[PDB]
Amino acid sequence: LQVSLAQKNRELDVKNEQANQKLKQMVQDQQAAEIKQKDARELQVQLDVRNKEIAVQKVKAYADLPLREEVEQLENAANELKLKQDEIVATITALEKSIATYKEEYATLIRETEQIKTESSKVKNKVDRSIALLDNLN
């Protein structure tokens, strides 16, 4: 029973490194996405200026009613954007999910590690407990 438990302790080391490895991939696979997020978040913010800007002038000039044509221009500009926003808000969701699953996955790979660590433990005790038995029997 000493041989087998030293064996299974091996089946664990590997089981654990195959996961302890893949888990490293997750960090350099989720930190990646997060970057886009934080990055592309700067854009949603940045371009937020424009809509809020182009917004007020619309209000003003529309009441103040080249103005006409100039206003035709604000309406288009705010359109170029309105579109380019739905553009990044879709880009944000892209990661939002992509990244939120890496978590649900990390957490899962964590459970696998936790279960492994414990097994290894419950085996060490049994092995330690066999070294005592062998010795008293000998």
Side-chain angles (χ1 to χ4, degrees), residues 1-9 11-19 21-27 29-30 32-37 40-41 43-46 48-67 69 71 73-79 81 83 85-86 88-95 98-103 105-114 116-125 127-137:
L1 177 40
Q2 267 203 181
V3 172
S4 79
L5 291 179
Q7 221 230 317
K8 188 162 184 72
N9 239 320
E11 279 93 84
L12 285 177
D13 296 322
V14 169
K15 228 181 111 98
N16 183 285
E17 273 192 302
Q18 307 194 325
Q21 226 288 183
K22 290 182 305 173
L23 190 81
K24 184 205 79 62
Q25 251 283 318
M26 198 105 59
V27 148
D29 247 67
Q30 201 208 80
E34 258 123 358
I35 300 152
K36 286 83 198 314
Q37 276 287 200
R41 277 304 197 181
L43 266 168
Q44 182 175 182
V45 172
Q46 185 175 22
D48 230 17
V49 179
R50 311 286 195 59
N51 281 20
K52 289 281 161 271
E53 192 102 65
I54 292 189
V56 178
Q57 295 170 64
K58 273 186 167 61
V59 185
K60 172 206 67 225
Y62 270 140
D64 272 56
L65 279 171
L67 180 42
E69 302 97 302
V71 173
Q73 155 202 61
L74 288 185
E75 209 106 303
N76 286 326
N79 282 316
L81 299 163
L83 231 60
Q85 236 154 321
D86 322 308
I88 212 59
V89 170
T91 302
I92 219 67
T93 297
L95 320 171
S98 197
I99 187 179
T101 224
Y102 272 67
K103 288 179 178 186
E105 228 159 68
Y106 177 71
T108 296
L109 219 61
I110 283 305
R111 290 193 301 280
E112 181 188 345
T113 281
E114 203 72 48
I116 287 184
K117 180 189 193 169
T118 283
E119 265 282 285
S120 289
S121 154
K122 293 299 163 282
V123 165
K124 240 280 301 173
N125 307 310
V127 169
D128 275 36
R129 235 143 62 223
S130 78
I131 296 189
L133 194 46
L134 275 195
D135 289 7
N136 291 331
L137 279 172

